[PDB]
Design an enzyme around this catalytic site. Structure first.
Site, short mmCIF file in Angstrom:
data_model
loop_
_atom_site.label_atom_id
_atom_site.label_comp_id
_atom_site.label_asym_id
_atom_site.label_seq_id
_atom_site.Cartn_x
_atom_site.Cartn_y
_atom_site.Cartn_z
N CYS A 182 4.54 1.74 9.50
CA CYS A 182 4.48 0.79 8.40
C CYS A 182 5.85 0.54 7.76
O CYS A 182 6.67 1.47 7.62
CB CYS A 182 3.42 1.13 7.37
SG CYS A 182 1.79 0.67 7.98
N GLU A 185 0.18 -8.18 0.86
CA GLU A 185 0.65 -6.87 1.34
C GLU A 185 2.16 -6.68 1.36
O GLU A 185 2.64 -5.65 1.84
CB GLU A 185 0.01 -6.50 2.69
CG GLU A 185 0.07 -5.02 3.10
CD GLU A 185 -0.39 -4.00 2.03
OE1 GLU A 185 -1.32 -4.30 1.16
OE2 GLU A 185 0.19 -2.86 2.08
N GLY A 236 3.19 5.68 10.51
CA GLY A 236 4.60 6.03 10.68
C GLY A 236 5.37 4.76 10.91
O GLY A 236 6.54 4.65 10.55
N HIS A 273 0.78 -1.24 0.00
CA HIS A 273 0.00 0.00 0.00
C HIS A 273 0.82 1.30 0.00
O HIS A 273 0.27 2.39 -0.11
CB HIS A 273 -1.17 -0.04 1.00
CG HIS A 273 -2.39 -0.72 0.43
ND1 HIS A 273 -2.41 -2.06 0.07
CD2 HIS A 273 -3.61 -0.22 0.10
CE1 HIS A 273 -3.59 -2.36 -0.44
NE2 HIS A 273 -4.34 -1.26 -0.43
C1 LIG Z 1 0.85 2.19 8.10
C2 LIG Z 1 0.54 2.84 6.76
C3 LIG Z 1 0.65 4.35 6.76
O1 LIG Z 1 1.51 4.88 7.46
O2 LIG Z 1 -0.24 5.12 5.88
C4 LIG Z 1 0.27 5.72 4.65
C5 LIG Z 1 -0.80 6.03 3.59
C6 LIG Z 1 -0.46 1.98 8.81
C7 LIG Z 1 -0.22 1.50 10.23
C8 LIG Z 1 -1.53 1.48 11.02
C9 LIG Z 1 -2.26 2.83 10.97
C10 LIG Z 1 -2.87 3.06 12.36
N1 LIG Z 1 -2.09 2.10 13.14
C11 LIG Z 1 -1.32 1.22 12.49
O3 LIG Z 1 -0.57 0.36 12.98
N2 LIG Z 1 -1.23 0.99 8.02
C12 LIG Z 1 -2.49 1.27 7.57
O4 LIG Z 1 -3.04 2.33 7.83
C13 LIG Z 1 -3.23 0.27 6.74
C14 LIG Z 1 -3.32 0.66 5.25
C15 LIG Z 1 -1.95 0.85 4.62
C16 LIG Z 1 -0.90 -0.08 4.88
C17 LIG Z 1 0.37 0.08 4.31
C18 LIG Z 1 0.57 1.19 3.47
C19 LIG Z 1 -0.47 2.10 3.19
C20 LIG Z 1 -1.74 1.95 3.75
N3 LIG Z 1 -4.64 0.14 7.03
C21 LIG Z 1 -5.07 -0.29 8.18
O5 LIG Z 1 -4.34 -0.55 9.08
O6 LIG Z 1 -6.49 -0.46 8.40
C22 LIG Z 1 -7.10 -1.11 9.53
C23 LIG Z 1 -7.21 0.05 10.52
C24 LIG Z 1 -8.48 -1.66 9.16
C25 LIG Z 1 -6.30 -2.33 10.01
#
Ligand SMILES: *[C@@H](CC(=O)OCC)[C@H](C[C@@H]1CCNC1=O)NC(=O)[C@H](Cc1ccccc1)NC(=O)OC(C)(C)C
Ligand SMILES: *[C@@H](CC(=O)OCC)[C@H](C[C@@H]1CCNC1=O)NC(=O)[C@H](Cc1ccccc1)NC(=O)OC(C)(C)C
Lengths: 188, 188
Positions: free
Chosen positions: B147, B71, B145, B40
């Site tokens: 991811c 993913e 942050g 993502h």
């Molecule tokens: C990391 C992705 C990020 O930083 O967004 C950039 C567009 C996110 C980590 C999550 C967010 C809140 N806590 C946590 O640990 N991951 C996500 O938000 C994913 C979607 C995503 C993953 C990797 C890259 C981009 C976007 N979505 C998600 O976690 O959704 C739920 C809340 C249903 C699990």
């Protein structure tokens, strides 16, 4: 490497999340019901400790003999549980250190460790309008959210994080003598 | 305790900050010029690596035989330096683990370690509109942050962080066989 086991034992037995009007801060409990927090947290007569509202029985904002801010505030709290006594891990004197860890316990980061590397006895720092003395400096880009964070090396708790300029971090030095059972002084 | 020495050797010799249109992500280099990043992140044909713009020579968005998202995206990069080969630290099979560490390398957090505790083979997760398989779950409030953040136990790199619900964290599982020198397949 850095003393991650040591930093982690401090975090588990001796930190709490403290919330004032200013926000959340890592709080280090030193002994009994006595803890520390940065002066700029602006402590009142109650504080949130792990979200439970708590009477602040006493708050001393340390300044040095030049009447300059040290950015440490020692607080006595009305709580039931005592802190493990960690005074024997406080350095006796100002010093320079290798390979420190900065540990944070907030709502946002209930548990996080940052090696910040070499720490130096910095001295004077303008904390944004507030002359402050007795500062430790590390070369690490530290952030808001990290204030109150505990700086350790193995067997030594040396300071609590209080500032940073985008490239360096700054901690208020902790010394053993801040906490010896002491004197008959009208202090407020 | 958790294998902080191990997590730290992975971070130093094998992570980079990767920036796509989506933002910054911890990036784990696995071998040669091959690295991983969460799908993502939306990888294009160039990416920023430690702020230096870099040609993405190849990008495979792993899906399983049910045609469901895993993913993970494996990327081949045009860079000069090779990654230390860490394939021998990839688990061979799905599994459950004790006392893991989540490590982050971004601009905001060039170096940070979070014990997340026990990790479980979770299976299916709805990643917000995207069915995803082969997920690991830990009970830790992980944040945006984080991811791309690398999940280790001692001697094992097991996944990269990809999501969290305010109370649990989720990582995409890494398996050894994702990276063996392989086949004659038209894949785009
Ligand atoms: C990391 C992705 C990020 O930083 O967004 C950039 C567009 C996110 C980590 C999550 C967010 C809140 N806590 C946590 O640990 N991951 C996500 O938000 C994913 C979607 C995503 C993953 C990797 C890259 C981009 C976007 N979505 C998600 O976690 O959704 C739920 C809340 C249903 C699990
Ligand atoms: C922690 C304090 C905080 O979170 O603000 C709550 C009101 C700050 C940590 C700094 C901020 C950016 N990086 C970094 O490491 N500390 C500060 O912002 C201090 C002032 C302060 C300290 C403690 C409590 C409240 C306010 N100021 C500061 O760092 O100024 C400079 C940039 C000159 C050093």
């Amino acid at each position: 490497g850095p003393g991650f086991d040591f930093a982690q034992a401090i975090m588990k037995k001796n930190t709490v999340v403290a919330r004032t009007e200013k926000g959340e801060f890592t709080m280090l409990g030193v002994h009994d019901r006595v803890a520390v927090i940065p002066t700029h947290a602006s402590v009142g007569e109650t504080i949130y400790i792990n979200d439970v509202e708590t009477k602040v029985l006493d708050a001393c904002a340390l300044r040095d003999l030049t009447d300059t801010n040290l950015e440490i505030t020692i607080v006595k709290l009305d709580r039931n549980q005592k802190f493990r006594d960690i005074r024997h891990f406080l350095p006796r004197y100002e010093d320079d250190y290798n390979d420190a860890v900065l540990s944070v316990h907030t709502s946002k980061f209930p548990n996080m460790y940052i090696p910040v590397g070499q720490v130096t006895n910095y001295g004077f720092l303008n904390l944004g309008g507030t002359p402050t003395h007795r500062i430790l400096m590390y070369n690490f880009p530290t952030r808001a959210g990290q204030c109150g964070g505990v700086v350790t090396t193995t067997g030594k708790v040396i300071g609590i994080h209080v500032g940073g300029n985008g490239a360096q971090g700054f901690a208020a030095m902790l010394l053993h003598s801040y906490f010896t059972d002491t004197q008959k002084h009208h202090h407020h």
